[PDB]
Design a protein around this ligand. Sequence first.
Ligand SMILES: Nc1nc2c(ncn2[C@H]2C[C@H](O)[C@@H](COP(=O)(O)NP(=O)(O)OP(=O)(O)O)O2)c(=O)[nH]1
Ligand SMILES: [Mn+2]
Ligand SMILES: [Mn+2]
Length: 430
Amino acid sequence: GPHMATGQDRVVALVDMDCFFVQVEQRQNPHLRNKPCAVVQYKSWKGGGIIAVSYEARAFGVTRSMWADDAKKLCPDLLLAQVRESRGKANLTKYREASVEVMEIMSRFAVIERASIDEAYVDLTSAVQERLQKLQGQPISADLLPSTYIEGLPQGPTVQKEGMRKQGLFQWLDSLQIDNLTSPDLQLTVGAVIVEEMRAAIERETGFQCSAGISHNKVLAKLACGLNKPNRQTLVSHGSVPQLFSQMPIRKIRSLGGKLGASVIEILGIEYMGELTQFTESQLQSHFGEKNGSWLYAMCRGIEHDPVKPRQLPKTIGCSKNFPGKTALATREQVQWWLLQLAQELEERLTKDRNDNDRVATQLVVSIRVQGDKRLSSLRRCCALTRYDAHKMSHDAFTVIKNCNTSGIQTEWSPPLTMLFLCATKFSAS
DNA sequence: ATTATGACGCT
DNA sequence: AGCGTCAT
Ligand SMILES: Nc1nc2c(ncn2[C@H]2C[C@H](O)[C@@H](COP(=O)(O)NP(=O)(O)OP(=O)(O)O)O2)c(=O)[nH]1
Ligand SMILES: [Mn+2]
Ligand SMILES: [Mn+2]
């Protein structure tokens, strides 16, 4: 009872940009705004592969991973923007730069963890304590939460979406105890006020809209974020967890969408996250290992301890290209030329990184995939990265992979290569 | 013939 | 160190 810690110590938010690459292209080209739109890489094969989709186009069934020609079948008026091509490959620099714009705004409010190109976790615990001090026990007006949903409300005792949103918000605000500066629900509420301000700042200063989740830990904040997209934020309280999880498929929780989540379902004979509460911690550890078992035991009760890491910059800088089917590389000249193309993009990105961020990579990882191997990487080898020089990096990558070529002929490469990947790692301050 | 990345756990 | 998983 009283000693049962409830995972309510922290206020954590997850901010994710809506259809991010689409918004970057719509900012640049106003003709694409408020239209069914998607972003594609390449063009020749089936119109290019879609990687981002506006919500207008999603209404027609267009999704990521779709070929643009098939998307056009679902939505003939779909508008398309193509990713830049440089040195024969997709080049994502425009989106990385746009991402920096958003991350620097977020960093004004709190220290952030860059989780991907378009999402960051925010630990708001201290900022909430400060705003609470300033409030002096003043209640929180619904005007301060104009885009916030309270998950699970309204309950009990209407037809429009905004009306439902406001009804639930009113129930939540009416039940708040604002004289208690340590009430977790009040703390989450103040956290949501701050996130409204953060999202307003991002949109004012970049033009980009985003969604957000506010809860007591990273997993719940990320799930909350997905509940009301686009351009809205969602508060998931500790108390909302039993009902939310009672019908939540296990695969919806971050890290359970793959083989481990499938094993949870199959071994335990369950479907929903809340069913996990009926097992002891030792039972879960027996099936899924000590770490996963402890994590699952806490997570199905809404509890997770993973910290928001103070990290705004990526830990690695990499360049990769697939060479599918008949485009697979089968000569030494080919392999060398593409290693050079990748290495030249890498050099450019690394030099700009060193100038911006006062650090230098020290290790080069070379990964290849060979024809007939279904794995992502067939082989990974590291070497030293001592100079930011594309010719040296590509020569070193060749040296560490060249023993793969099973061809007796010097000129031929067998079996042919269907992927090259160069990744700079192990950064040191410079 | 999804593709291009990135984080992180295991041994 | 090199490989596998999860993500998207
Ligand atoms: N190169 C590449 N980029 C990708 C891929 N998948 C996503 N991206 C890029 C394009 C995406 O815009 C961006 C962010 O990924 P999300 O948050 O997963 N999707 P979004 O922000 O579009 O929609 P939502 O409103 O539902 O969050 O990453 C991929 O497979 N390859
Ligand atoms: Mn997004
Ligand atoms: Mn994202």
